[PDB]
């Protein structure tokens, strides 16, 4: 009974939820309690049921939604823009037998692995409340897109909804995947560049390997690359 965890698209199949992996295989839950996850994208932990385009699975944990917001705005300081107030640890961590970095899920979706620092809380309610304070927004500044541009550059804007000193104290290591539907971004990129698709998407992050202080001399900028692929 092979086991697997990973990022999947969430399907609404006439009211029942199924999933689709990055290879395009539909994963059909056979759990006796219905899946009720309301997300566009998810992280699941599962096993393949015995008796082998669709595979029946048993979920081994409650599915987790991982949707995050991608926006376009013309430049820094305009409507919808977000100001970073915390550094990530990295946009990479260990998944399976290797490290994973920002990657392409489908023509419409990309995924950021985020390694970051949270407050040390212990009640289930508190942990859930703490996690909700962290928002990872990808921003495309459309004024920066010029005619012919083959590179789509996105800024990770990471905001913690807490006071500056409490942000600085966070030290508990956490990992999460964040999935971004980027069709609207791609549409705007096409209109400004005249290109049908970018050769690559770049993700620009403020990260700090040592502490959670944004204005620390250890905070660096790091650019992660995604080679953008299509069936066409
Ligand atoms: Cl569920
Ligand atoms: Cl509790
Ligand atoms: Cl570049």
């Amino acid at each position: 009974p092979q086991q697997w965890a990973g990022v999947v698209k969430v399907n609404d199949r006439m009211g029942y939820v199924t999933f689709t992996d990055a290879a395009g295989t539909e994963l059909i839950p056979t759990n006796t309690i219905p899946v009720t996850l309301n997300a566009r994208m998810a992280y699941i932990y599962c096993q393949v049921d015995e008796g082998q385009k669709s595979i029946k699975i048993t979920l081994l944990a409650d599915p987790t939604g991982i949707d995050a917001t991608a926006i376009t705005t013309p430049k820094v300081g305009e409507s919808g823009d977000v100001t970073t107030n915390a550094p990530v640890g990295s946009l990479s961590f260990v998944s399976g037998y290797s490290t994973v970095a920002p990657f392409q899920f489908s023509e419409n979706t990309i995924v950021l692995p985020v390694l970051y620092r949270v407050k040390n809380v212990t009640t289930t309610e508190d942990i859930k409340n703490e996690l909700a304070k962290h928002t990872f927004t990808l921003v495309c500044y459309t004024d920066d897109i010029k005619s012919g541009d083959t590179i789509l550059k996105l800024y990770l804007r990471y905001k913690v909804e807490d006071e500056p000193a409490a942000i600085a104290e966070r030290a508990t290591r956490t990992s999460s995947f964040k999935a971004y539907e980027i069709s609207q971004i791609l549409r705007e990129y096409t209109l400004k560049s005249g290109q049908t698709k970018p050769a690559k998407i770049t993700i620009v992050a403020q990260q700090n390997e040592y502490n959670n202080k944004l204005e620390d001399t250890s905070t660096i900028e790091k650019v992660y690359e995604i080679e953008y692929k299509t069936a066409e």
Side-chain angles (χ1 to χ4, degrees), residues 151 200 202 225:
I151 298 179
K200 74 175 174 194
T202 60
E225 301 183 315

Side-chain angles (χ1 to χ4, degrees), residues 4-12 14-51 54-158 160-168 170-208 210-222:
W4 180 80
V7 170
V8 296
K9 179 187 181 158
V10 175
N11 313 127
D12 183 8
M14 198 192 72
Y16 295 101
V17 175
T18 73
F19 309 99
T20 301
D21 69 12
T25 313
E26 182 160 8
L27 308 176
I28 310 281
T30 62
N31 297 74
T32 52
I33 307 302
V35 172
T36 54
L37 176 68
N38 196 2
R40 206 190 59 77
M41 297 280 313
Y43 182 80
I44 64 178
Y45 173 31
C46 74
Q47 81 178 14
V48 175
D49 294 346
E50 301 276 64
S54 290
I55 294 176
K56 305 256 203 187
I57 58 158
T58 295
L59 294 158
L60 293 175
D62 188 31
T64 310
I66 61 174
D67 296 324
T69 304
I71 65 131
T72 53
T73 186
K75 61 182 181 175
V76 171
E78 298 277 55
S79 166
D81 197 21
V82 176
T83 292
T84 289
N85 72 2
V88 303
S90 54
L91 302 185
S92 175
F93 53 75
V94 173
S95 188
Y97 299 115
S98 197
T99 194
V100 56
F103 69 90
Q104 188 183 2
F105 177 80
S106 70
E107 288 180 5
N108 297 300
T109 305
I110 59 170
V111 182
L112 280 47
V114 194
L115 201 59
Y116 65 106
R117 287 163 280 254
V118 299
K119 181 176 183 182
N120 182 2
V121 290
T122 62
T123 77
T124 303
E125 299 81 348
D126 287 358
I127 290 169
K128 289 173 185 180
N129 183 64
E130 171 51 18
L131 291 172
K133 289 184 171 282
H134 300 264
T135 60
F136 304 91
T137 300
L138 287 177
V139 188
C140 184
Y141 298 103
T142 58
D143 285 352
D144 297 344
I145 311 168
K146 277 77 190 210
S147 185
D149 191 7
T150 61
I151 298 179
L152 174 56
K153 177 161 30 185
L154 305 176
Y155 286 79
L156 178 60
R157 306 302 202 191
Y158 173 26
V160 182
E161 196 191 8
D162 206 343
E163 294 291 291
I167 298 170
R170 289 174 157 80
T172 306
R173 187 179 64 205
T174 306
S175 56
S176 306
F177 289 108
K178 297 283 166 190
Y180 300 84
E181 210 292 334
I182 59 160
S183 295
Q184 288 181 348
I185 308 319
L186 291 162
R187 200 196 41 74
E188 279 292 277
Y189 157 82
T190 288
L191 287 168
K192 306 288 196 192
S193 70
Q195 299 272 15
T196 61
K197 57 174 181 184
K200 74 175 174 194
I201 303 170
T202 60
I203 306 294
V204 185
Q206 295 184 96
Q207 74 185 50
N208 178 331
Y210 299 115
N211 58 65
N212 215 45
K213 291 175 293 192
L214 186 60
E215 302 307 313
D216 193 80
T217 56
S218 284
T219 300
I220 60 157
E221 184 148 310
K222 185 154 181 196

